[PDB]
Design an enzyme around this catalytic site. Structure first.
Site, PDB file in Angstrom:
ATOM      1  N   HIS A  61       0.836  -1.232   0.000  1.00 47.25           N
ATOM      2  CA  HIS A  61       0.000   0.000   0.000  1.00 47.25           C
ATOM      3  C   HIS A  61       0.855   1.261   0.000  1.00 47.25           C
ATOM      4  CE1 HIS A  61      -0.620  -1.550   4.241  1.00 47.25           C
ATOM      5  NE2 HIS A  61      -0.415  -0.282   4.615  1.00 47.25           N
ATOM      6  N   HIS A  91       5.955   7.026   6.261  1.00 49.09           N
ATOM      7  CA  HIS A  91       5.569   6.626   4.905  1.00 49.09           C
ATOM      8  C   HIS A  91       4.940   7.839   4.231  1.00 49.09           C
ATOM      9  CE1 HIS A  91       1.997   6.180   7.365  1.00 49.09           C
ATOM     10  NE2 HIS A  91       1.350   6.628   6.277  1.00 49.09           N
ATOM     11  N   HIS A  93       1.875   9.112   1.082  1.00 55.57           N
ATOM     12  CA  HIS A  93       0.759   8.899   0.152  1.00 55.57           C
ATOM     13  C   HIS A  93       0.986   9.837  -1.025  1.00 55.57           C
ATOM     14  CE1 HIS A  93      -1.517   6.862   3.433  1.00 55.57           C
ATOM     15  NE2 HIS A  93      -0.802   7.661   4.198  1.00 55.57           N
ATOM     16  N   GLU A 103      -3.614  13.410   1.440  1.00 54.01           N
ATOM     17  CA  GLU A 103      -4.817  12.921   2.161  1.00 54.01           C
ATOM     18  C   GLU A 103      -5.549  14.110   2.757  1.00 54.01           C
ATOM     19  OE1 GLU A 103      -3.545   9.368   4.488  1.00 54.01           O
ATOM     20  OE2 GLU A 103      -4.523   8.431   2.735  1.00 54.01           O
ATOM     21  N   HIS A 116       3.762  11.030   6.426  1.00 53.48           N
ATOM     22  CA  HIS A 116       3.232  10.710   7.751  1.00 53.48           C
ATOM     23  C   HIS A 116       4.337  10.117   8.615  1.00 53.48           C
ATOM     24  CE1 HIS A 116      -1.089  10.442   6.074  1.00 53.48           C
ATOM     25  NE2 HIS A 116      -0.692  11.699   6.317  1.00 53.48           N
ATOM     26  N   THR A 195      -5.598   6.426   8.472  1.00 54.22           N
ATOM     27  CA  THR A 195      -6.217   6.655   7.148  1.00 54.22           C
ATOM     28  C   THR A 195      -6.226   5.406   6.283  1.00 54.22           C
ATOM     29  OG1 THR A 195      -4.231   7.356   6.030  1.00 54.22           O
ATOM     30  CG2 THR A 195      -5.502   9.085   7.190  1.00 54.22           C
TER      31      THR A 195
HETATM   32 ZN   LIG Z   1      -0.393   7.606   6.174  1.00 55.08          ZN
END
Ligand SMILES: [Zn+2]
Length: 257
Positions: A61, A91, A93, A103, A116, A195
């Site tokens: 992911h 990590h 996104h 996000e 994050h 999330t």
């Molecule tokens: Zn995250």
């Protein structure tokens, strides 16, 4: 299993994880005019000088840069927090295009990516116990925009070829996360959730106002990662972001005027 596609993406997660429709879900849109300045909020204390990175993992992911969290070596405190939160991993996104990927949004603006830095409250002893508590985690969120390169990101970019597919890991020692911070630690804060599944409502979110700049070439390398495992049909790891969720009965507070 859950993911980011048409048949398994965010709009489906509630079937396996009903808290997806809960009262304190993340991310949210930050309406800058409605966020209230809170003079009671303290400066954020980011103490990363003794951080010990260990490994980088493609978990199917995103990719996680993991830290030794077996002592207070890299801790977040102050800001809106009570007590001490230990860094476990960071990590990102990101999007398929520079116009999406974050996000959180700011007055509906989407950034190209969002970092994050995940920390757990030492009063609960282990990450697994912390995620079962409403004040278990503190996640420091940092927006990425495309412009100048971020020199402190390049070591991450250059190891990604070695973890292209789901379940691949690589040694990743001596990485200093201080090189991913913007100048200002001005922030917004609100109570929210993980999330990704399991979407637990255990996070104090701290979202920095000042983005970092990364180059087009740096984010393009994120977009060469794969969601799939080795020897499976290639599915580029892009658009691994959850969209903004209803704010419901929450206030976003600003550390700055
Ligand atoms: Zn995250």
């Amino acid at each position: 299993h859950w993911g980011y596609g048409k048949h398994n993406g965010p709009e489906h997660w509630h079937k396996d994880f009903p808290i997806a429709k809960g009262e304190r879900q993340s991310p949210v849109d930050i309406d800058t005019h409605t966020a209230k300045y809170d003079p009671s909020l303290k400066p954020l204390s980011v103490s990363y000088d003794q951080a010990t990175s260990l490994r980088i993992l493609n978990n199917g992911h995103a990719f996680n840069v993991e830290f030794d969290d077996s002592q207070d070596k890299a801790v977040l405190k102050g800001g809106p927090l009570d007590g001490t939160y230990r860094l476990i991993q960071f990590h990102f996104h990101w999007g398929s295009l520079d116009g999406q990927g974050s996000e959180h949004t700011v007055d509906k603006k989407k950034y190209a990516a969002e970092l994050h830095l995940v920390h757990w409250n030492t009063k609960y002893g282990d990450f697994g116990k912390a995620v079962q508590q409403p004040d278990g985690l503190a996640v420091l969120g940092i927006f990425l925009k495309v412009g100048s390169a971020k020199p402190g990101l390049q070591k991450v970019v250059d190891v990604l070829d070695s973890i292209k597919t789901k379940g691949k890991s690589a040694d990743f020692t001596n990485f200093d996360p201080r090189g991913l911070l913007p100048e200002s630690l001005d922030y917004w804060t609100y109570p929210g959730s993980l999330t990704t599944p399991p979407l637990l409502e255990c996070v104090t979110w701290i979202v920095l106002k000042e983005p970092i700049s990364v180059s087009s070439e740096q984010v393009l390398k994120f977009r060469k990662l794969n969601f799939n495992g080795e020897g499976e049909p290639e599915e580029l790891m892009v658009d691994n972001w959850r969209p903004a969720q209803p704010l419901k009965n929450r206030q976003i507070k600003a550390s700055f005027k």
